Design a protein around this nucleic acid. Structure first.
Ligand SMILES: [Mg+2]
Ligand SMILES: [Mg+2]
Ligand SMILES: [Mg+2]
Ligand SMILES: [Mg+2]
Ligand SMILES: [Mg+2]
Ligand SMILES: [Mg+2]
Ligand SMILES: [Mg+2]
Ligand SMILES: [Mg+2]
Ligand SMILES: [Mg+2]
Ligand SMILES: [Mg+2]
Ligand SMILES: [Mg+2]
Ligand SMILES: [Mg+2]
Ligand SMILES: [Mg+2]
Ligand SMILES: [Mg+2]
Ligand SMILES: [Mg+2]
Ligand SMILES: [Mg+2]
Ligand SMILES: [Mg+2]
Ligand SMILES: [Mg+2]
Ligand SMILES: [Mg+2]
Ligand SMILES: [Mg+2]
Ligand SMILES: [Mg+2]
Ligand SMILES: [Mg+2]
Ligand SMILES: [Mg+2]
Ligand SMILES: [Mg+2]
Ligand SMILES: [Mg+2]
Ligand SMILES: [Mg+2]
Ligand SMILES: [Mg+2]
Ligand SMILES: [Mg+2]
Ligand SMILES: [Mg+2]
Ligand SMILES: [Mg+2]
Ligand SMILES: [Mg+2]
Ligand SMILES: [Mg+2]
Ligand SMILES: [Mg+2]
Ligand SMILES: [Mg+2]
Ligand SMILES: [Mg+2]
Ligand SMILES: [Mg+2]
Ligand SMILES: [Mg+2]
Ligand SMILES: [Mg+2]
Ligand SMILES: [Mg+2]
Ligand SMILES: [Mg+2]
Ligand SMILES: [Mg+2]
Ligand SMILES: [Mg+2]
Lengths: 84, 54, 96, 64
RNA sequence: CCAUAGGUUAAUGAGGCGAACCGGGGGAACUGAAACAUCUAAGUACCCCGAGGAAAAGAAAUCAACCGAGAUUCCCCCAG
RNA sequence: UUUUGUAUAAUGGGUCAGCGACUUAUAUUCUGUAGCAAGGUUAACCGAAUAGGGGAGCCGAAGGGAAACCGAGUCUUAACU
RNA sequence: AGGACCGAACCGACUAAUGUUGAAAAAUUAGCGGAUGACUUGUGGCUGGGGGUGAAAGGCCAAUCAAACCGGGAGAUAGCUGGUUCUCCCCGAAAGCUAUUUAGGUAGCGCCUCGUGAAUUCAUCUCCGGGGGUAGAGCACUGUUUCGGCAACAACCCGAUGCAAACUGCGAAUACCGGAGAAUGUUAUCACGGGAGACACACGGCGGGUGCUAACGUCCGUC
RNA sequence: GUAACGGGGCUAAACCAUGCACCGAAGCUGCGGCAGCGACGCUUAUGCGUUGUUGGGUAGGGGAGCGUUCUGUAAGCCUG
RNA sequence: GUUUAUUAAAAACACAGCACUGUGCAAACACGAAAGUGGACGUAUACGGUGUGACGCCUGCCCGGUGCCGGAAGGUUAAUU
RNA sequence: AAUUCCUUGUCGGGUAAGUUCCGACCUGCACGAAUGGCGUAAUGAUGGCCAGGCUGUCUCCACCCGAGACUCAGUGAAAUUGAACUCGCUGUGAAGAUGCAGUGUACCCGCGGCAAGACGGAAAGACCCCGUGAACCUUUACUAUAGCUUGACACUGAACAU
RNA sequence: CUUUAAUGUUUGAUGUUCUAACGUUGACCCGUAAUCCGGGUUGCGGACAGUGUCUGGUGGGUAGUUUGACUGGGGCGGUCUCCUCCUAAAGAGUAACGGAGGAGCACGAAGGUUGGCUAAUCCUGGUCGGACAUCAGGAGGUUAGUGCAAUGGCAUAAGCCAGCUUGACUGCGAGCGUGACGGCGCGAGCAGGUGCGAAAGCAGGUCAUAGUGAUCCGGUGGUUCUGAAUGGAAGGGCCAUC
């Protein structure tokens, strides 16, 4: 089954990483924020990190849901537009 | 893969109901024994001794 | 006729099993017309002009659809709430 | 006479309330379905757009 | 031995041409399947025999579906 | 003509005259146009033959489900969401 | 006597010149080999095409032979080459992606054109809200690297100096994303539907892999 | 075979700086005309005058037309 | 001696000789759907097929592989019942 | 060596000088015993090398005799050919220019003679690659099949021993 | 009746012999002043041979075909899927026979939850040391450990340990991401029943990203979906799976 020859010519055919869902959109339970793929809970994102960190979404519908763990775990709080 | 030595397929089964549920197992690793719960056609869980019973 | 790139493959993926209703087609009798070009003898078998079953068939079962009777010894074996409650200005019947 | 390609019939014959005959779905079924649970629900079929046109030719008179 | 085999004679008749359609015996490959063996082309091409003015088929061990139709043939539908 | 590109030393033609290549059949689908309208239309055939007659039948006014089946609902699911 | 010797006829063809739109679709001229033999020749006959014949070269089978000629299946097939006829007006490409026994072919998407719709959709600019780890820089980390201080001649730690696509404790321009706003452009925008063509692109600028910061080189990006 | 300003020829007819002037394209303007669309003036099936603007173009899409042979209109009309 | 008629006449083909092998005659083998015919009106000192190629001196070791020849006890094994 | 790559091997011979030739050696890239080994008189339009003779093969061509070539009278082809008002040089350029640019040069038109460009003519490259081409050909490619073989049942029966 | 022996048998085997199908390219007689053929007699062979159907061999004797592509010509070599990083111009994405490696798994736990716990390394001490072994304190700061590449991530740890378990659940899914498409991925929330926790709550397999094969033809189980006169059945569908 020899397809061994280094050559070092070999792809990855990469996907999903992208920072789509930039800034505070109008809302929608859209993804917006994915990076590393997996992802779990999130809710109305607030952009978090540590040290510096803490993006500030501010705008979404009622449950963004996205960001795995490489970018501000979970989120959501009381922020919507006027209140939540 | 389909080496008669390593991982195989576990047909699995339940106690009266004629369900299925499938998964993988081994051979050399302790076997000839199995049973979990899993949910059948409907109702409660229980039994599901699958193949290789204690 | 050089349909280079046969439509089949690449379009031809996944093909669910299936069979066929041996029912000829069991036309519904019709658009809630029974009685009136229906021979006005209300029952139903075949010799009709405006709404016809077309004859070759096993059973009927009418839906309710267009405009109904004013008279109607509805038979046709058949059914539906659309039927029992719209054709009901007259002649129930169902038989077998 | 135009001969419908009897194959595609068995394949995606349909015609919702507006053509766009709903093909079908399912993948690995009846071969390798010893894998994945959630991502495998037969649900129902669906059609296409970029591809519909090709799958269009069969049928003519409503048959089944 | 018979009797046949064979022989002679005689009267009838055949024999050969023939365009196509028609019945029948034998029967491709290119081609297509975007390759190729199943499969297709096609029982087509072709070759052989036979007969008619037409040939062939034809008065159910047919079909139907619990109602019934009623030999064969040809035409439109059923249906791509 | 073919090409990224040809005065090209890449292809074709000595010249003239005549001929020389998207047709045809049936089927299906769009567009325009005409007829009629929830109805439209006949086929073979008959024929005082382009009439008139013939509505066998084809399409549309219902759809959903693999189907039985139900039906402006219906599948899905034990579910009435 | 002799598949004996020399040599005409006869049979054959080793060499050179000429011819090469010839006198000639293989010959002429001068030489040359055999010449009682597996010889040479007249007449007629027999072997038929996947078949014949063959002292064997795939040679010969009527100027035709790795399968004759004639007629037919036949308008075989040709993703290839060529060619394609009158006139005016409007719009106007692509030479990409993804598959492909696919790579000079196709097919879906993209881009052209024609129709019907639809919202102050589109686009430039002003401001607002965003994420970034590029250029640049730096050397805490990964790893290179010096030079100076503590190792029966050197890692390890301190100070001073560099280097990096697969280093980053920093970080632009900027492109992209969404929100308002004025103005401007014969909805430029999107959707669905008819017809497409089109997937060989070449050069120049900028950012780069390669190659030698070689090539009218080659492969991406962008204008 | 000058062939490393295109040639001539140049001490400035080179270069550097500064400023004015002139040549220079199918670019723009002027004048006339053609066609599409939006408007304007009206008129008002409609249409025409003014105006703004659009009119390079292979594959290819769309839209208009000319001409030829034959049929109807045709023992009608044209012609020794 | 023969050969590429029409670019090769040779070291190539043939040859006499040698060897292996097959054939008991309705021969093996070949032409042929068959009948039939050739082999041969011959019959092992004969006929076929293969290789070597006068003559001289010779022609060594390998039977593992493939092929062929013999055995066929035992294993495996078709139709058939 | 009809076999040796290194290779013009090394030594000897022939030569004024010999990558060939002849005689050796053996280090046989990669001879070898009937897909015969080593010899062999004779024969050979057979391959290689040397010599004598002979000479225009040559140094180096000269003259001459004839058939053309040239001129006149008669008859009268050919391939090729987009159109020509068809010069050189350097540069340009789809990259080797009569045709573009600059420049040089050149009164108009024949005849004999030569071939250096017209990438000259001829033949839709014979090499190379490509086509999901073609043909023959090979085999332990595949799938079939004639032929040769196997056995069962038929055509096909009678008894007997085990 | 059976375990078993003899005779009758029926029938399968080998082997014996016979004539009578069958052969005779032996002789003789007619047709016939024929070498054919046919009949007859005779001989030799004989249920053999041989033929037809079926069947195992063998089968380049012949026939039809296949024998890939990418490629700085082609060929040799290498590669044809998937995962990670750089190229990749700080949103995606983008090439080269460009520079480096990994997958074609593993796991009744290596999953779930609950409760709890935190490296590596060095210094000083310590018996069995003389580099590192368990102990003690100190410096103890991703320089540890992540089941396997690389990137990203990880202390609320996903890293480590134990108790209890089977959520590696069934039916759906707002709305999204990504694809020409087939398809692929994310997913709060809902319904039925679960496990762990006092409880808020967590769980729809593993820290995430590779560990994969469409269709057809079928196999197995389930279901009154269908079942060609009807009742069944075969077969077909549907669901689960190979
Ligand atoms: Mg009717
Ligand atoms: Mg084919
Ligand atoms: Mg070119
Ligand atoms: Mg030219
Ligand atoms: Mg002409
Ligand atoms: Mg002689
Ligand atoms: Mg010559
Ligand atoms: Mg002579
Ligand atoms: Mg002589
Ligand atoms: Mg003769
Ligand atoms: Mg000839
Ligand atoms: Mg044909
Ligand atoms: Mg042709
Ligand atoms: Mg393929
Ligand atoms: Mg930098
Ligand atoms: Mg292409
Ligand atoms: Mg391309
Ligand atoms: Mg390009
Ligand atoms: Mg280039
Ligand atoms: Mg001026
Ligand atoms: Mg001007
Ligand atoms: Mg134009
Ligand atoms: Mg001789
Ligand atoms: Mg010759
Ligand atoms: Mg010769
Ligand atoms: Mg020999
Ligand atoms: Mg020698
Ligand atoms: Mg020997
Ligand atoms: Mg010899
Ligand atoms: Mg002359
Ligand atoms: Mg010149
Ligand atoms: Mg030049
Ligand atoms: Mg000359
Ligand atoms: Mg030439
Ligand atoms: Mg050519
Ligand atoms: Mg062959
Ligand atoms: Mg073929
Ligand atoms: Mg290739
Ligand atoms: Mg990026
Ligand atoms: Mg960018
Ligand atoms: Mg210690
Ligand atoms: Mg993991």
């Amino acid at each position: 089954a020899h397809k061994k020859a280094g050559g070092s010519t070999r792809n990855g055919r990469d996907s999903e990483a992208k920072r789509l869902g930039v800034k505070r959109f109008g809302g929608e339970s859209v993804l917006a924020g994915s990076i590393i793929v997996r992802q779990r809970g999130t809710k109305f994102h607030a952009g978090a990190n540590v040290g510096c960190g803490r993006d500030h979404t501010l705008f979404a519908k009622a449950d963004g849901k996205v960001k795995f763990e490489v970018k501000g775990p979970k989120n959501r709080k009381f922020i919507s537009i006027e209140a939540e | 893969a389909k080496g008669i030595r390593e991982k195989i397929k576990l047909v699995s089964s339940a106690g009266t109901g004629h369900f299925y549920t499938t998964t993988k197992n081994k051979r050399t690793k302790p076997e000839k024994l199995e049973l979990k719960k899993f949910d059948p056609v409907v109702r409660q869980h229980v039994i599901y001794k699958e193949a290789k019973i204690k | 006729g050089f349909e280079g790139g046969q439509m089949p493959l690449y379009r031809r993926l996944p093909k669910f099993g299936f069979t066929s209703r041996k029912a000829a087609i069991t036309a519904e009798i019709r658009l809630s017309d029974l009685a009136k070009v229906e021979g006005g003898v209300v029952d139903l078998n075949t010799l009709k002009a405006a709404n016809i079953i077309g004859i070759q068939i096993e059973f009927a079962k009418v839906i309710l659809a267009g405009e109904v009777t004013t008279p109607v010894t509805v038979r046709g074996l058949r059914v539906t709430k659309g039927a029992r409650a719209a054709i009901e200005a007259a002649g129930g019947k169902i038989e077998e | 006479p135009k001969i419908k390609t009897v194959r595609g019939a068995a394949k995606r014959f349909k015609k919702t309330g507006k053509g766009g005959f709903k093909h079908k779905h399912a993948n690995l079924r009846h071969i390798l379905t010893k894998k994945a649970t959630k991502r495998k629900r037969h649900l129902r079929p669906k059609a296409m757009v970029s591809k519909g046109d090709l799958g269009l030719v069969i049928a003519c008179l409503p048959y089944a």
